[PDB]
Amino acid sequence: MATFISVQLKKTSEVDLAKPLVKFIQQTYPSGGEEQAQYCRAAEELSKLRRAAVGRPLDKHEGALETLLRYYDQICSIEPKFPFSENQICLTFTWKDAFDKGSLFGGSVKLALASLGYEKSCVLFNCAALASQIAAEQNLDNDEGLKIAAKHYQFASGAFLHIKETVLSALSREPTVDISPDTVGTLSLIMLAQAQEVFFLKATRDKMKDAIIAKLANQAADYFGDAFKQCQYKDTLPKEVFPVLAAKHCIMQANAEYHQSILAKQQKKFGEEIARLQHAAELIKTVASRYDEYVNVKDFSDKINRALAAAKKDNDFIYHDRVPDLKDLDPIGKATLVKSTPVNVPISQKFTDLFEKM
Numbered sequence: 039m040a041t042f043i044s045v046q047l048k049k050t051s052e053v054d055l056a057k058p059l060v061k062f063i064q065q066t067y068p069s070g071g072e073e074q075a076q077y078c079r080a081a082e083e084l085s086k087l088r089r090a091a092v093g094r095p096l097d098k099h100e101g102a103l104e105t106l107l108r109y110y111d112q113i114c115s116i117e118p119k120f121p122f123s124e125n126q127i128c129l130t131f132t133w134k135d136a137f138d139k140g141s142l143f144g145g146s147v148k149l150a151l152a153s154l155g156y157e158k159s160c161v162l163f164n165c166a167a168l169a170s171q172i173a174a175e176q177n178l179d180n181d182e183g184l185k186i187a188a189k190h191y192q193f194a195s196g197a198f199l200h201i202k203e204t205v206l207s208a209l210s211r212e213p214t215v216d217i218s219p220d221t222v223g224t225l226s227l228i229m230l231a232q233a234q235e236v237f238f239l240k241a242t243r244d245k246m247k248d249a250i251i252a253k254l255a256n257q258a259a260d261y262f263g264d265a266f267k268q269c270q271y272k273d274t275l276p277k278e279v280f281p282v283l284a285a286k287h288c289i290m291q292a293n294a295e296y297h298q299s300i301l302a303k304q305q306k307k308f309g310e311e312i313a314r315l316q317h318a319a320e321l322i323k324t325v326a327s328r329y330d331e332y333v334n335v336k337d338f339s340d341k342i343n344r345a346l347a348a349a350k351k352d353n354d355f356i357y358h359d360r361v362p363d364l365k366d367l368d369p370i371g372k373a374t375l376v377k378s379t380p381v382n383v384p385i386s387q388k389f390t391d392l393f394e395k396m
Contacts, residue, residue, distance in 0.1 A: 039334065041282060041286075041332065041333055042173070042174040042232055043170070043174070043228055043232065043278075043279055043282055043283075044167070044170040044171040044173065044174040044175075045136065045166065045167035045170045045171070045194075045225060046136055046137075046167060047096065047136070047164045047167045047168060048133050048134055048135070048136045048160050048163055048164055048167075048216065049133070049134045050092050050093075050131065050132060050133050050134075050160070051132045052089060052093055053088070053129070053130070053131060053132075054085060055081070055084055055085030055088050055129070056078070056081045056082050056084070056085040058127065058128050058129045059078075059081040059084070059085075059120065059129075060078050060081055061128075062120055062127075063077050063078055063081070073395065073396075077393060077396060080392040080393055081392075081393075083392050084112060084116070084392055084393075087105075087108065087109050087112060087392075088109060090105050090109070091105050091106050091108070091109030091110075091161065091164075092106075092109070092161070092164070096168065098168070098171050098172050098175055099172070102168065103165065103168050103169060103172060104386055104387055106161065106164055106165045106168060107165055107384075107385045107386035107387070108386040108387075108389065109161055110158060110161050110162055110165055110383070110385060110386070111383050111384040111385060111386045111389045111391075112389075112391065112392065113154055113157060113158045113161065114158060114383045115383070115391040115393065116154070116393060117154045117155075119393065119396055120154075121154060124152075127152065128152075129152055130150050130151065130152040131150070131151060131152075131153070131156055131157040131160070132148060132149070132150040133148065133149055133156070133160045133214070134146050134147065134148050135147040135148070135149075135214040135215060135216045136163070136167070136216040137215070137216050137221075137274055137275060137276065138214070138215060138216065138274075147214060148214075149211075149213070149214045151209065151210055151211065153208075153209060153210055155207075155208030155209055155210075156208070156209055156210070156213075158208070159201055159204070159205055159208055159209065159213075159217055160217065162197055162200065162201055162381070163197075163198075163201055163216070163217055163222070165193075165197055165385070166193070166194040166197035166198050166201075166225070166229075167194070169190040169191075169193050169194040169197070170190065170191065170194045170229055170232075172186070172190050173186070173187045173190035173191045173194065173229075173232070174187075178236065178239050179243070181240075181243070184236055184239065184240045184243070187232075187233075187236045188233050188236040188237060188240070188376070191229045191230070191232045191233035191236060192229070192230070192233045192376060192377060192378060192379045193379045194225075194229040195226050195227075195229035195230040195233060195378040195379065196226075196377075196378040196379030196380055196381055197379070197381055198222045198223075198225040198226035198229060199222075199223070199226040199378045200380075200381040201217055201219075201222045202219040202222045202223045202226060203219075205217055205218065205219060205222070206219065215274055216274070220268075220272075221274050221275070223268070224265060224268040224269060224275070225275075226378060227261060227264055227265040227268065228265050228279070228283065230261055230376055230377075230378055231258060231261035231262045231265050231283075231286070233376045234254065234257055234258045234261055234374060234375065234376040235258050235262075235286070235290070237254055237375040237376060238251065238254040238255050238258055238290075238293065241254055247301075248297040248298070248300040248301045248304075249297075249298075249301050250373065251293075251297045252293075252294045252295075252297040252298040252301065252370050252371070253294075253370065253371045253372055253373035254373055254375065255290050255291075255293035255294040255297060256290070256291070256294040256370045256371065256372050256373075257372045257373055257374050258286075258290040258293075259287055259288075259290035259291040259294060260372065262283050262286045262287040262290055263287045265283050266280055266283035266284050266287055269283060278332065281329055281331075281332050282332050282333070284328075284329065285325045285328075285329035285332055285333045285335075286333070288321045288322070288324055288325045289321070289322070289325060289333065289335065289338075291317075291318075291321050292317075292318040292321035292322050292325075292338070292342070293318075294370050295314045295315070295317045295318040295321070295370070296314070296315070296318045296338075296341075296342060296345075298314050298370045299311045299314035299315050299318070299345070302314060303349070307359070308349065308352070308353050308357045308359040309353070309359030309360050309361045309362055310359075310362060310367060311349050312346065312349045312350060312353060312359075312361050313361050313362050313363070313364060313367060314367070315342060315345055315346040315349060316346065316361075317364055318342050319339070319342050319343065319346055322335055322338060322339045322342060323339070326339065
């Protein structure tokens, strides 16, 4: 279908990374044509690497992400050498906010800083955003799609969370909102929610126990629920985000209850089955009327209604189980298969620091 949330990449203007880095090499590097004027072609190499990571109208592929990741690893490796205190270091990175259009009354929202902390913050944001795009793009009724989407969602979650913990110490100023701890904390939870939904979807495909699927769905409802609560009083993220999180919260509760009801029927608890099915129907009716424009809930509602109609029919004419109230049923349990991937450099596949010997 279409309904996963992904993140648009921030834009930068191009900058000459080499030229300023060239002027610093004349240090414990004396004569011409040596490590001296080799490192300058590695600085020539790294400036070229920035334009590939950040300059190109992008590619939602293994290739483009790896470029970004490499560019992140490479910056991280370059700080403990150059502007460790910098009284001038003539080099300034400019980034547009990912979300804030600005106002067509006076242009976009941008922020220029002469800081490697700023730069790597925005790059990492973009590694996260491209990962969510690749993740969202994947075919979920195919097994390696499921795995690529769960891997990238957890990466993107871990990467957003790394910026939250790190943006402020990393920077000179109050950041743009897109990378400020609160937005990126929320983006972190969304990606983790989506990761878990992918693990629920995979469980449904591995045709696992309904008991385990209910717990995985219940866990997701919590991730989506927390996330939409973080968005309730705020209008930073694209406007589709909060309604998708709201629906996805009720959808996952409805999956939890539907699967738990199947278990209940297996155990001949026919009243419990109707109760849990009534709850699922209600959750889904709510999402259908309230969130029409964002999710398509029809097949799942029909599935629930047939099961409810058959349950009621046999119970009234055969079993006569008392249908319990919701508050009298045990909580459905919770299980997570999902974690925010720590950012430990190198995050790129076959990392070569172009300035290893320095």
